Symmetry: D2
Amino acid sequence: TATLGINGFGRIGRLVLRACMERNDITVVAINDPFMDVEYMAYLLKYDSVHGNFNGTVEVSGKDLCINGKVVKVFQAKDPAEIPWGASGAQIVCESTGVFTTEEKASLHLKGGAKKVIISAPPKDNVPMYVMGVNNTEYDPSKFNVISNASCTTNCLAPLAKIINDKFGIVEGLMTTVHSLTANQLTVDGPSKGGKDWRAGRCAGNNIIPASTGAAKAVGKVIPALNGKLTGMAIRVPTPDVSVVDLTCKLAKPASIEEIYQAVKEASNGPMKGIMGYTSDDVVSTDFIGCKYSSIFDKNACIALNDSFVKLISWYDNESGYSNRLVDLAVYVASRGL
Amino acid sequence: TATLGINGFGRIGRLVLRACMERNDITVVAINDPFMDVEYMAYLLKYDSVHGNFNGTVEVSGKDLCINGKVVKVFQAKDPAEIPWGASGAQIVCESTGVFTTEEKASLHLKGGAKKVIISAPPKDNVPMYVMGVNNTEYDPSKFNVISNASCTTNCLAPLAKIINDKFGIVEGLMTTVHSLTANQLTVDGPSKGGKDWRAGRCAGNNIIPASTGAAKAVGKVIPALNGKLTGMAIRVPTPDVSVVDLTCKLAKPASIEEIYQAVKEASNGPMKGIMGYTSDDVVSTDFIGCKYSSIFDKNACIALNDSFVKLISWYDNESGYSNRLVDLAVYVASRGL
Amino acid sequence: TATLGINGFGRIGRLVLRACMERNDITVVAINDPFMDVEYMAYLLKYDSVHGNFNGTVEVSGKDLCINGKVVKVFQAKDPAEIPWGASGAQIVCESTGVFTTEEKASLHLKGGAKKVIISAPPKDNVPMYVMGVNNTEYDPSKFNVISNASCTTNCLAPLAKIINDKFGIVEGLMTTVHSLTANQLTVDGPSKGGKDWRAGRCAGNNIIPASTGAAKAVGKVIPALNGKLTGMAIRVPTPDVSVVDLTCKLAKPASIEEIYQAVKEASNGPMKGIMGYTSDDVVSTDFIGCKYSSIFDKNACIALNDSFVKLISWYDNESGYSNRLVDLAVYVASRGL
Amino acid sequence: TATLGINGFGRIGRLVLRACMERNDITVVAINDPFMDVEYMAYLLKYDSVHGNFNGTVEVSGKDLCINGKVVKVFQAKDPAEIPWGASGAQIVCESTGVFTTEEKASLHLKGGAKKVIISAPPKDNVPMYVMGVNNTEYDPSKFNVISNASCTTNCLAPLAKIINDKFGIVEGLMTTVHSLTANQLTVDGPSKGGKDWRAGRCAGNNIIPASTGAAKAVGKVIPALNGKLTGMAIRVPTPDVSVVDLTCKLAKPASIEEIYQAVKEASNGPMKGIMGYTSDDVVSTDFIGCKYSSIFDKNACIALNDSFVKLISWYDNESGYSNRLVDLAVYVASRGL
Ligand SMILES: NC(=O)c1ccc[n+]([C@@H]2O[C@H](COP(=O)([O-])OP(=O)(O)OC[C@H]3O[C@@H](n4cnc5c(N)ncnc54)[C@H](O)[C@@H]3O)[C@@H](O)[C@H]2O)c1
Ligand SMILES: NC(=O)c1ccc[n+]([C@@H]2O[C@H](COP(=O)([O-])OP(=O)(O)OC[C@H]3O[C@@H](n4cnc5c(N)ncnc54)[C@H](O)[C@@H]3O)[C@@H](O)[C@H]2O)c1
Ligand SMILES: NC(=O)c1ccc[n+]([C@@H]2O[C@H](COP(=O)([O-])OP(=O)(O)OC[C@H]3O[C@@H](n4cnc5c(N)ncnc54)[C@H](O)[C@@H]3O)[C@@H](O)[C@H]2O)c1
Ligand SMILES: NC(=O)c1ccc[n+]([C@@H]2O[C@H](COP(=O)([O-])OP(=O)(O)OC[C@H]3O[C@@H](n4cnc5c(N)ncnc54)[C@H](O)[C@@H]3O)[C@@H](O)[C@H]2O)c1
């Protein structure tokens, strides 16, 4: 049974813990976050403005947390090397602070005794990215101690792109993701951290905000065959959670929406079960809150100009789907020997 | 000077009036709306959650309105034929009820003394559509008494599509328009008007909602050369006003974003002055509230996969841009003889 | 087991059905709504932006619905007297259309064979109002066949006022309820249904909107001793669900927030179990979505100027609390003999 | 002509500058904000998600700004003592960083050459607070070099309380302010800066959030006669700007809503012109965006239980009203002798 330690108990960090609490093949044993006292952590875990009250019990036991009768050690270290993961028995660390996305920084968790590290975001350097159901079996435990679970958008696009490319072939594609807001955004017009993404610093509650994303490009690394064939952008909107991918692509072989739908269905019911999903109902974003799939094809919203040029629509709970995939990755990593 | 009569004093009708009050080449002489007393009409004109207080004075004078010292006759006819446009001195009628989108119905305004009628939406029949700066000069007064100003989305896409197709040639394109809130969506999950668009009946305040749009095809009627080369859809988000068009297309001639940008700029400073606009700043939706342009190219938001496959982003205040275009068309129609 | 018929399959009608599906002492056997196709009814029950997916199975069976393998008859009678409640086996009717709020109209259901009717709103005439945990045992089956479950605001305020008045005595009080959005409001500035409340017709998504409410005075009828001692108003804000009562009162007997808290605690763990609740945590509105309590005291939000002038804060999921109470009342009504 | 220097170019700092640009008796000569490049500053002044595009011109000149022709020196000092106010010719400094709310920290501006300092918030120590139209004439230049313009909420309540206390006398009162969000709140559930106000760290876009505020008590300092007679709390909501005060008070002398209205009317058209305002229209929050009044009485929203127990409703653009008052205070200070 793999043990997990969480650094950065934020949106992703807390949902990863919630996912672990629902499984018997992985146990959370420690959490670190310098911006939260143990009482604050208990509070943020218990209540969620999007996913409801925690399904179980949360209590402070001395300096630590007692979640569902299990003891979870708490730390407040500003630097990863200062967290006693080993002494705590944490084998794999979910690096979800958003501030240590390189091998150099993320590897600091190793000094602390961790055996493996999973960055909950695409890396800034060459750390390998894996997407469950697409290329995770490529992971080599003898070569990597620090890996990446990519982004929420890449986890939505990769599985779909794989299915389409395998069956029909993607000549070229452009993507736009209408994405719900994130912690990086601001409630009122203000300066963005580091003064880089100016648009991201504009009132999140009343603006449609164009944004950059490397998700489409990253798919070209997770699926080499698609290198240089995809690129995209993002549009941030006021909703608290759930996003949607709009993939416009030219196919190498003709395909109707019905045929694309059938290909997605065969994949979802077989090799990508639990990862790729689909629907034919008149859904809207809130219907996916809490959905654990990485990508859900919206049949009725897809459109096609002709048999080779189509626009595919796929939903994803950027918080829930991604967190469950990170947990799946952690379990997979454990199964391959730490 | 042309005199205008407004049927349906809704979001569009009211903005059209506000636009006229600012111009000397056109005067609003009458308003008709059976769903609101004169007192309520005055209230709706003086206060607006998106465009602010009315710039001027608004008084109730008997059964009519005194706006900026001018008399505006008010009527509560339910049937377009019962409205005394001629007696009021109304030459052109702005048909903005959204219920008379056919020449048969819309033509009823002529039985009241009105000479011309402009439907503030795409017609359900064969009524000709005109987009200012694109095909309005094709209008012939001796052949049509009832015309259409198309839709807000069409007025944003058509200008852009024309510049791009003229300069580089559009082989095929797919559009997605992210729309702000409209008068059809619901505040809470409830029955849709007609029980046809189920998604549109879902809570608009906390949902991303896929929707249909005929704009892409309408552009194929406004610009015959693009007939059958475009199609699209919409995605509604919880913002009060301002929308954006995401146009993904394959070009005939290779073109960089810089060149596309330069081409828009030339048209914007020339044959489409006041219609086509452009920006290179990190703008967000709220920056366009009140903007009178039909379409505003967002240079930094555009992205290109190759020199022949690009995604263009263009903003448009779905209310202000469109309304001002309808008044421009009214003025144009009058300049051609009634 | 008591059987329920639902007239008006709106927000309340649907949640009433969801509430019944979880209980074994009451079953919905029929639904009537002439402005909603069964296919759409199935859709609205299956999906909800606020309460999530329906916990169970909903299928269209001919012209009726099959819910959890049970046939629920569906009608389209615009006139209550035309609904075959009796033939359908419906004993008690949940009148939730919002248009038959008088004894004259509501009693038409009796012509259809129903034995009792519960109006899901305060009546326009003198139909008796009952609030579970407050005055429902005053219901006399031999004298009334038509009753009212009052309003969501009243169900929140009445239990709290009863506790405070019983223990300390309320000399006089003023209430303000901050309400989350409801169907009544509009997504954009426009005419209100009836043209009475101009403010209510303003854009609900970006406005704080003052409004009227008779809940404070209704409490004076539900609790006679408080007649003439309470009055109040409402303030609508752009949040999807869950509201809060802000009660400012002068007490006849001195009391600290701690003692008021204990009094509420006693009631909540005693005579008002499942009706009145309480919390000492730093909660926010979303933490109550789905909560079945009628009123939840927020200890930390309460404030006192002195020992006899206090401001008490109580939360309520205006949809979930109210609906579960209506069902409780239906079960209570049946237990008293039909 | 008074000169102004601004430290903390945030919501208030930028609106203070905007207010100045519209006046001929005061000029901004310098701005300091370490989290903004001169280009970023130009951008944030040029665009505003709530108050629209800047009315005038803004260009980067070397390392400074050129606003409407006037040159404005730009600094990036994190430590107040390091800002060369004196050399820049800035006489009065607007301390709007939100982090230097004490005489000790704020007075550090004097070391740079500034002559007077105004903290744009209530102080954490004994720095005197002044509310234009209420007690600003009690200012004494020979006594203080550092003063406070109190809070936005206090500027709304103080004028109203003074009028009511002067005319009828306030026995006791409890206040609740429904407040739009601020920069302190978060877009998604997270840890509040400092680990204090936990509720303030909950998703701002979809929650009704109770909060503390010393504004009511502060009124007791600005109006000694009211010390110990008022207190209150706040309720934060998703709107970007504009707030409303709900004052429930017991009057020493009986008074009707009409009489209270007349008293505010007299004050508004007399001693408090430009400060206290009133309305009898069906207004909503957006109608006050850009309003320069400190407090606007909503006659129709007020309600009374008796002749001595009333609930008064008063609006205020927390950003615009306050900023203009701060500028009014700066001019008043200059007129007293620097
Ligand atoms: N929000 C999403 O839907 C989503 C989806 C996929 C991936 N991600 C990625 O996951 C990461 C976290 O995202 P999030 O949305 O949960 O952000 P968040 O802001 O909600 O949480 C980040 C946490 O990091 C903590 N933190 C900051 N510095 C720290 C330090 N030195 N040590 C330990 N903790 C520290 C913060 O206190 C916070 O609790 C980011 O890299 C993000 O891009 C986010
Ligand atoms: N909202 C937009 O941004 C936008 C943009 C482009 C085009 N349009 C089109 O413009 C039209 C109006 O849109 P809107 O958003 O202003 O709608 P709206 O709901 O705000 O107003 C419609 C008005 O029609 C009135 N009406 C109904 N029957 C009438 C009758 N018989 N005579 C006179 N008035 C009558 C209503 O009382 C109402 O005031 C629609 O056809 C719409 O599709 C809207
Ligand atoms: N929304 C709340 O949180 C809440 C809380 C307490 C009380 N209430 C009250 O409950 C009632 C219903 O509220 P709601 O939000 O569900 O309304 P709603 O607008 O969501 O639904 C009303 C339903 O009435 C139906 N209807 C109209 N005429 C009908 C007829 N002749 N026969 C059958 N159905 C008919 C409509 O088709 C619709 O489905 C109202 O009186 C309301 O004031 C609502
Ligand atoms: N927002 C309101 O409606 C309102 C109303 C009344 C009073 N106030 C008070 O005004 C102050 C500012 O409020 P705001 O909403 O504009 O905040 P804000 O977050 O919008 O702006 C604060 C600015 O301070 C800057 N800053 C931080 N440290 C600095 C430093 N060392 N030197 C110079 N600048 C620095 C930030 O970069 C930012 O631009 C606070 O004290 C607040 O409580 C705000």
